[PDB]
């Protein structure tokens with residue numbers, strides 16, 4: 512019965528409601544641990560992650576002290592692939608010090624679902640349990656639903672914490688500013704853009720500086736990458 | 746019940762076989778028309794679209810001869826939103842000239858499903874019929890399936906046409922080349938990256954030129970944007 516959920520998320524307006532709802536859905540389908548992580552496209556060098564999980568307090572603090580995101584293969588699947596993943600904490604060969612430590616906190620049998628979202632958000636819903644591997648008969652029972660709720664969860668989580676982790680989501684670029692960045696994306700100089708758009712060079716640099724301040728960028732190369740990562744150049 | 750589909754998609758190796766499968770799904774689920782479109786990220790200025798629909802031929806030619814891609818609010822929804830959409834051509838207030846002609850050819854009640862995929866491909870499956878609105882009972886009946894088949898279809902549509910519509914999808918970047926472009930994204934110079942990474946400046950320029958040649962780009966700014974759009978910079 513997925514009809515009742517559509518009204519639940521239509522009224523949720525805080526993290527604690529999101530922290531409580533995903534926890535309730537985590538247990539309603541036979542899972543003890545959940546982890547809804549989102550990867551903002553900023554900063555473009557080392558992007559910032561934001562997780563909301565009920566993992567043990569020792570694990571929620573140890574995951575950040577050693578930068579486990581750079582070695583976690585569960586994060587890697589959501590970054591390069593677009594399909595769900597069924598994983599058992601004992602199968603992975605590399606990063607044994609990470610999995611031998613993760614298996615201690617009851618993070619063994621899990622189900623992670625990567626989804627894309629607005630403003631360049633690469634989110635993923637992960638429901639983990641310390642018992643019973645997920646078989647093919649259990650997957651096809653809840654596969655189509657968990658794919659649907661993952662898109663709905665990240666959609667509400669999107670509009671909820673976008674102004675926090677993606678402050679440039681509220682940026683609106685004018686028609687001139689957008690085409691200035693579209694041509695800066697292909698490495699056009701101010702003079703090359705002038706001949707393309709048939710205006711003066713000082714008018715090309717004009718809209719660039721305004722777009723950089725809107726996107727809170729220090730140069731036009733970073734502003735263009737920022738505008739593209741959010742979707743202002745689609 | 747999807748065992749035929751999951752086997753059919755594995756057998757499909759041509760663009761004509763893909764048209765037949767989507768036409769079978771379009772009718773098996775109570776619709777007259779379908780449209781599957783994919784947007785390659787290149788060129789970054791005006792990206793090229795590729796459609797496959799059984800719309801009336803008069804509409805298909807008018808859609809391209811008048812460049813309806815720029816004004817179609819369904820196209821705008823798929824680029825900016827990540828959730829399914831139920832639309833009725835008679836509800837829209839703006840772009841009436843576009844909707845009155847689509848309603849003329851029977852494109853009235855539609856169901857559009859945007860999906861993201863490898864190599865920066867943005868795809869969307871649309872199911873349209875000229876009568877009988879899509880009620881809430883009908884949506885909760887087959888939305889989970891239509892969400893699932895759209896992800897499978899775009900995966901096949903990718904492998905089918907990615908070597909043609911995104912030629913840089915076969916490009917693989919090394920670790921050094923990847924991080925050179927990561928710092929080039931934020932406007933760093935050759936010397937700044939060399940100090941940041943504690944490597945010789947000539948080695949930085951070395952990997953940059955190689956990445957430009959692999960990604961078929963004339964300047965490092967364009968190559969950086971190309972690598973990001975394909976997902977090489979994640």
Ligand SMILES: CCCCCCCC[C@H](CCCCCC)C(=O)N[C@H]1CCOC1=O
Pocket residue numbers: 545546547548549550560562563564566570571572574575583585586587588589590613618621625633634635637
């Ligand atoms: C996939 C794109 C970004 C999404 C990141 C979330 C995926 C990995 C999360 C990280 C949990 C960190 C919580 C600290 C408070 C996850 O579910 N990891 C699992 C898998 C291995 O052990 C875990 O804890």
Ligand SMILES: CCCCCCCC[C@H](CCCCCC)C(=O)N[C@H]1CCOC1=O
Pocket residue numbers: 779780781782783784794796797798800804805806808809817819820822823824847852855859867868869871
């Ligand atoms: C989001 C990724 C891009 C997907 C492009 C397709 C979306 C819109 C399609 C276009 C069909 C073009 C066929 C002629 C070649 C679509 O079905 N649009 C509908 C909406 C209203 O009238 C249409 O034609």
